[PDB]
Design a protein around this nucleic acid. Sequence first.
RNA 1: GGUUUGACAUGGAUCGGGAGUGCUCAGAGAUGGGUGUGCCUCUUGGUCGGUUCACAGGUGGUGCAUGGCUGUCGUCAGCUCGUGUCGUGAGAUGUUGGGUUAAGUCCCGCAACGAGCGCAACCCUUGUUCACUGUUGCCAGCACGUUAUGGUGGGGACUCAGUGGAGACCGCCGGGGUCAACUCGGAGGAAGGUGGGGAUGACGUCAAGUCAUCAUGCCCCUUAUGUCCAGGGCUUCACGCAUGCUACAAUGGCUGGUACAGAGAGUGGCGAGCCUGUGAGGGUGAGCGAAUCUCGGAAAGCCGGUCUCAGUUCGGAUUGGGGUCUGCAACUCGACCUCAUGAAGUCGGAGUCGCUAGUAAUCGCAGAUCAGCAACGCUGCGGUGAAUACGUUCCCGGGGC
Lengths: 86, 84, 98, 60, 206, 155
Amino acid sequence: QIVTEPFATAGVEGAYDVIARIGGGGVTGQAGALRLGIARALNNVDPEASRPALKKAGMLTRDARVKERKKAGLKKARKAPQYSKR
Amino acid sequence: PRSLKKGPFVDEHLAKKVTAQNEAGTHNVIKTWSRRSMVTPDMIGHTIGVHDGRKHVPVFVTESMVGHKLGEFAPTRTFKGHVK
Amino acid sequence: KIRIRLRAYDHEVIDSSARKIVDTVTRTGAKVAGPVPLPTEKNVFCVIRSPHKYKDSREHFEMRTHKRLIDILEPTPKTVDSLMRLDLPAGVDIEIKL
Amino acid sequence: AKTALKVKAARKPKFGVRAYTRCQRCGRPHSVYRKFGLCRICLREMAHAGQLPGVTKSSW
Amino acid sequence: GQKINPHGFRLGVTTDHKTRWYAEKQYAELVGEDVKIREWLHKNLERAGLSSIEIERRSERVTIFLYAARPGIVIGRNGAEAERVRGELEKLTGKQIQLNILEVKSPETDAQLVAQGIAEQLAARVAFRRAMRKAQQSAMNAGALGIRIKCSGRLGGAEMSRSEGYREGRVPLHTLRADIDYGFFEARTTFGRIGVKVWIYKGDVT
Amino acid sequence: PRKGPAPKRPVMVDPVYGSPLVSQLVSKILLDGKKTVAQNIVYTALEGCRAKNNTDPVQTLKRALDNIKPSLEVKSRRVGGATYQVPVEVKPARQTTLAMRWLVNFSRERREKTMAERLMNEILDASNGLGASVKRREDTHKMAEANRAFAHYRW
RNA sequence: GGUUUGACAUGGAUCGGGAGUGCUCAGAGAUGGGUGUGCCUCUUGGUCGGUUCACAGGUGGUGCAUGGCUGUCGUCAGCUCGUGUCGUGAGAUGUUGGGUUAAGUCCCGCAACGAGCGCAACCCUUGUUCACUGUUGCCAGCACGUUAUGGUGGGGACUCAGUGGAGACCGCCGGGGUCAACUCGGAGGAAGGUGGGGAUGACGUCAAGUCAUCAUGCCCCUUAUGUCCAGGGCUUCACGCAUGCUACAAUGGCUGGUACAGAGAGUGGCGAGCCUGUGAGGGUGAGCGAAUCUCGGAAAGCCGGUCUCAGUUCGGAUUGGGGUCUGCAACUCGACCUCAUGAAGUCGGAGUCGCUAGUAAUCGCAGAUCAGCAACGCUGCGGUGAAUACGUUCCCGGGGC
Ligand SMILES: CON(C)Cc1ccc(O)c2c1C[C@H]1C[C@H]3[C@H](N(C)C)C(O)=C(C(N)=O)C(=O)[C@@]3(O)C(O)=C1C2=O
Ligand SMILES: [Mg+2]
Ligand SMILES: [Mg+2]
Ligand SMILES: [Mg+2]
Ligand SMILES: [Mg+2]
Ligand SMILES: [Mg+2]
Ligand SMILES: [Mg+2]
Ligand SMILES: [Mg+2]
Ligand SMILES: [Mg+2]
Ligand SMILES: [Mg+2]
Ligand SMILES: [Mg+2]
Ligand SMILES: [Zn+2]
């Protein structure tokens, strides 16, 4: 759904072919990247009739949410070792 | 354990001492620090003083010793129990 | 034809050396592929900051090796002599594959 | 470290397996890096003072 | 206790490495010879006053820049001391050493020589307050934008240890674009040794 | 927190049934970070629901949620030297959250073998008006009614 | 068990020419005895020898004699100074007050006017984009390729690599805000009010830690507290605490198939391929000093089959057998393979811990040290990916007055 819905929110529908080359990440990350790519393609094809709705749906935006780095003294990015007073 | 294709490890001076004992009479105690060595049939019936860290404890090697190291029979730690 | 590998720790001196090489070979004709940047080697060392009993506070260091590649398409033995005789900064090394 | 220990480590061991590293500036036997010798403290202080080329603080 | 070395903090950003060579199979041994060279030079050239030792290598050839306040000691008479120190350098390393000695334009502004002088005065048993004030005043007469000196130890031969410091002007340690020269020395007294640290804010750099 | 009400992440809708309720249900099951496992469980339960009754599984899930939704619940209060159980009205979002949490927990506590149709059985029982979830809703409402005398402590 | 100017430095003398070593012998080894080989200049050096002479050596003491480095309160919002002024004086004012901010961040007023260290910014990384370059990277259009592999000529489009730029500033619009700082909403935009994370830790506190990394004052040892060696110990076990790992199963176990990573390492190294073995492995052995070659398989997941709630086809402790590899050597005291064995454990008392988003939870991967490894540790890396925050009443820590 996350990759098909750019067409659904655009005027065009499932009568418009697409070819994708996908690299890196996992399945969900690849889905999100493909969704953003299709959204940007529709954007730069028709930046007037599909731009408003396509951007309003929050789809011409790349979320910078990336795995936060591990930190010294902590088990994970933010998880901390079990504090033990005395 | 040690690889089979490398053969048993006898410390190459224990071997020569036990061979000399065999040649000149199997009656003497052979003092050694070679806990590292492998018991072999050629030394069966000998008595070997194996070092245990502070004293050469004597072991009389029998038929069943062969598949063991010399140091297995010379305990290094003394416990005796907690309290008394 | 004719590979030139440049490796150093400072990308400023890497770029300056690559520019000097390319401008030299060109001054001796020899058209040459542009300096292509290879991925930088990135070694990381984590060190306990304190000399004793303080492991939760540490310091991280990196040794970044920057690498550039040059191709000398034109054989040009005059450029061969030039590239073997010119002088480069001490921080950057040169590797010539004939 | 002790001078005798430092010289013993420097000299060729009896058996190859018996060799060890030692901090080449410091004599410290723990936490010695193969890339550049030295040790934990020696690395930290020399990297701060700037005698190790390419080595800088990392804050990625 | 919790402050970073200014030179290490600004390394790569504003200040540069003292050694410039590349080697990936010998790195450790070149580091070792560099350590030997620096230790030998520091141990045998205290009198000259060493700001920095800068080492370069091209191919089995080492080049040593010695930044000294008074290179008169290093050069001796008609370069005799320079030749003898170079010869000791080949004896120590085994490589071709090209040694050149450079002045410091403002020794009263270079922090390392300032720590040198303050520690020398402390060893000669000069009042630490007077020594720090003299160094501070000389630095600002030269034209540094900020001085900070801190002497820690058994100051004045006492029993308890103190951490007496002087500063005026501005020394923004937290600013990376700030050009801050840092020096440190140890005054060897009959009562242990005193650690003297000097920060000098030369100015702002890009 | 002290600063103020933190923003809420928008709730997405289920691609299959087109209802945010099922997405909330899967995100509540969602053990160990296995979204696919959780929604396989949820879809299996909903399909079992539509198998055992002709009505729509999303509608039966909705009916179960209304039957488990609490209206008011008591919270601890530190007035004086003894603790009070002050009844407080529950907002629609909070009560939907409570209904979903109770549904999932009691489905996990049910005796049947597999989680998928443990949850299916619990959903059907709740929609009918029976089960541990509905019992807990009734018990919390009963205890709120018992401690109803402290409705004047609300702030 | 050996040794005594010593295991190692530096300097004077003094007798020297070998030092240093190969093979052997004795020895647990240290070491000692053989045997072979035996300086380059030069008539006075490099190198060693003793005898000494100086002297070395100490992980021996004191962290409450110290330097250095570090923890810590605490990323807390503060701590001070010059001059003026007030007060006999310590001292105060600035630095109080109103508003605001993540912030002593700013704004307003003000016997204060200023400045400094902290805050912020400059730095690194991540999110958008442009120019430049195009291999070892990439393949849209063009020509073949053994069928096949961007394998090929070639291409600057896309991706990426890495250099240099652009971009965010409450800058614009509207409201609030006496105004003013700020604040709310909106547009544009990849990103909006500090966008996320790191580096960075003020004046000082705790005579906090470290004399054992190093350095050092004083004291102490000097045929021993130096130093060499073999064996042992640091791995003990009636117990107690602490940090973790694997679990107690069905959101699971087993089994076959099948997808999608990132960041890293490598020449005594990473090792493909083939052969051999149940396997650890062994034998051969290309390739790669590496965007090329190798580590390499990602695992969770999906799909098919199966187990059917059983102390189990859960769990994998323990114990018996047979092995592999590293190493001079796996008894004490290594990892791993295989066969058998199949312990406690049914979700854990009082109490207690972490976390506000790509976080918690979980899933695998890589590196440092390292012959090997007790690593489930540590430092990183990506995959999947939540619930909730009404609120400050209460608990703990802190800030202004
Ligand atoms: C004993 O000698 N006389 C009587 C005084 C003394 C003298 C010289 C010292 O050098 C020290 C002490 C007191 C101890 C006390 C230590 C203790 N600690 C070991 C748990 C402690 O309770 C704390 C603490 N919690 O803060 C400390 O302060 C501490 O560590 C410390 O610094 C000490 C010293 O080293
Ligand atoms: Mg602790
Ligand atoms: Mg070792
Ligand atoms: Mg202390
Ligand atoms: Mg102590
Ligand atoms: Mg800052
Ligand atoms: Mg103490
Ligand atoms: Mg000492
Ligand atoms: Mg231990
Ligand atoms: Mg490499
Ligand atoms: Mg937070
Ligand atoms: Zn060291």
